[PDB]
Amino acid sequence: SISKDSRIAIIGAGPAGLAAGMYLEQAGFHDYTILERTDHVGGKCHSPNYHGRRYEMGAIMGVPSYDTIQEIMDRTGDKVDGPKLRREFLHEDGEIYVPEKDPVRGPQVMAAVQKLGQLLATKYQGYDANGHYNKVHEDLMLPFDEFLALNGCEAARDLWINPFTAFGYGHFDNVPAAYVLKYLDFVTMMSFAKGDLWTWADGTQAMFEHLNATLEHPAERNVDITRITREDGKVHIHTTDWDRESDVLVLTVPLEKFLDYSDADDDEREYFSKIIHQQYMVDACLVKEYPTISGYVPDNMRPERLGHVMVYYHRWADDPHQIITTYLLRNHPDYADKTQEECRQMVLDDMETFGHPVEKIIEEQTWYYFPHVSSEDYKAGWYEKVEGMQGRRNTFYAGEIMSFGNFDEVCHYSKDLVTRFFV
Ligand SMILES: Cc1cc2nc3c(=O)[nH]c(=O)nc-3n(C[C@H](O)[C@H](O)[C@H](O)COP(=O)(O)OP(=O)(O)OC[C@H]3O[C@@H](n4cnc5c(N)ncnc54)[C@H](O)[C@@H]3O)c2cc1C
Ligand code: NA
Ligand code: NA
């Protein structure tokens, strides 16, 4: 419903921004500009170099159901060519164990997982749609454990938790079911269970670097946007080097932060102020005693264990002097934030306990991760409001908050945005 001569400003050159550009271009919208704050593209798909190979400070993997990412690879020529993923399970004291062989718990999990699968296919059909503009069943608005409890499927959490909480998405005691099941829909959960997982030799960042290259208008980098105002039916953007006018604004950046440099209206302030995010910290480590496999720590995914390492990534199996990244969470609604100080010490103390002591941390990042809203705010209609606001003063809303904090979900949402409002 937008004219092709519309000047479109895309904020953010992560997967969501780059995809917005790709799919606008492909629909015949050629006057777009992507504005990126940093000197690089890919956002949280971030793959730096060390000793001739790239490691992952962010996203690592996908599943075969990453249809939109497949479309992106078709465009760039990239292939799923990374090292195969495999894992073991550790207790908080470093003891290796196999949860699948628990005689009492094992059959409980498998019963719940099967019952849930059947409920998802029928009672909750539609749960798995990208975005939240299609209003989900009320049960899905509850925290994941409450959702499970209502259906007698509590034991399902043992399977679902490992690719969720450890991957920094937070805890089932509070994170609403709708987020969990849009990412870990039954097919995706199964793909994780089987280990049918994509990785990239040159990192997840590589294909978005290449996507950028294939664009008619690659991202403008190092753009320090100080002001956006939206009067007279136009979008005026002010940076450090220039101020310029566009017709349409497309946001793939943190929307609560956008409040601080925009003429945000009453609804934007009110609703974007409700956004909560995860403080997810990655440390890239040189280790003595190199693992021979990646490790998960369900024990350390309990809220009572916030700040502890929940998982570590074994990437290059052939070189014991390569990077092993560790993952912990710094926040939870029921607790005060953990300091970077105390969490870094837990990285040292946890890895030594696991038998993989750290010689060096060469890089650390706490990421702005998984923007979402509370079960109450979800129930109160958050996305009915925000999706209802779409196109208001030529501003459109996208990125992680409108879908989910994964790179297929955001790209798929960007694709559909063009379908929903532009064509
Ligand atoms: C440790 C880790 C593990 C992950 N694991 C997976 C996984 O297994 N599978 C998966 O699918 N995803 C995974 N992800 C999530 C995935 O990387 C993100 O969901 C994805 O990058 C989202 O893309 P986005 O563009 O929507 O936001 P982002 O990736 O955060 O990119 C946003 C962009 O906007 C820019 N920006 C922000 N503010 C401004 C400003 N005001 N002005 C201009 N530009 C701005 C940023 O610099 C950035 O480039 C992981 C991420 C991390 C950190
Ligand atoms: Na299992
Ligand atoms: Na999905």
Q: Where are the domains of the chain?
A: 1-76+195-274+370-423, 77-194, 275-369
User: Could you tell me which residues are beta bridge partners of residue 147?
Assistant: none
Ligand 1: which residue has its CA nearest to atom 13?
59
Label residue 93 exposed, middle or buried (CB < 10 Å: 0-12, 13-18, 19+): exposed
| Tally of CA atoms within 13 A in the half-sphere of 224 that contains its CB | 2
Per DSSP, the three-state class of 248 is strand
Fold classification of 1-76+195-274+370-423 is: FAD/NAD(P)-binding domain (3.50.50)
In our burial notation (b when 16+ CB lie closer than 10 A, e otherwise), range 210-233 reads bbbeebebbbeeebebeebebeee
Q: How far apart are CA 129 and CA 116, in angstroms?
A: 17
SS (H, E, C) 129-183: CCCCCCCCCHHHHCEHHHHHHHCCCHHHHHHHCCCCHHHHHCCCCCCEHHHHHHH
Q: Mutation test of ligand 1: which of 407, 414, 415 has the most ligand atoms closer than 8 Å to its C-beta? A: 407
Rounded to the nearest angstrom, the distance between the alpha carbon of 120 and the centre of ligand 3 is 13
Q: In the PDB record, what is the listed experimental method?
A: X-ray
DSSP 102-133: -TTHHHHHHHHHHHHHHHHHTTTTTTTSSSSS
Helices (H), 170-305: 177-183, 186-194, 203-214, 255-258, 266-272
Q: How far apart are CA 325 and CA 282, in angstroms?
A: 6
Q: How far apart are CA 39 and CA 222, in angstroms?
A: 5
15 lines ligand 1 (CB under 6 A): yes
Reference 320, options 353, 354, 357, 352; nearest CA is 357
Rounded to the nearest angstrom, the distance between the alpha carbon of 203 and the centre of ligand 2 is 27
Fold classification of 275-369 is: Alpha-Beta Plaits (3.30.70)
Stated resolution in angstroms: 2.0
Is the separation of the CB atoms in 16 and 414 below 8 Å? yes
Fold classification of 77-194 is: Guanine Nucleotide Dissociation Inhibitor; domain 1 (1.10.405)
407 lines ligand 1 (CB under 6 A): yes
Determine how β-strand 248-251 pairs with β-strand 243-246.
unpaired
18 lines ligand 1 (CB under 6 A): no
Determine how β-strand 8-11 pairs with β-strand 324-329.
unpaired
Rounded to the nearest angstrom, the distance between the alpha carbon of 128 and the centre of ligand 3 is 5
Label residue 125 exposed, middle or buried (CB < 10 Å: 0-12, 13-18, 19+): exposed
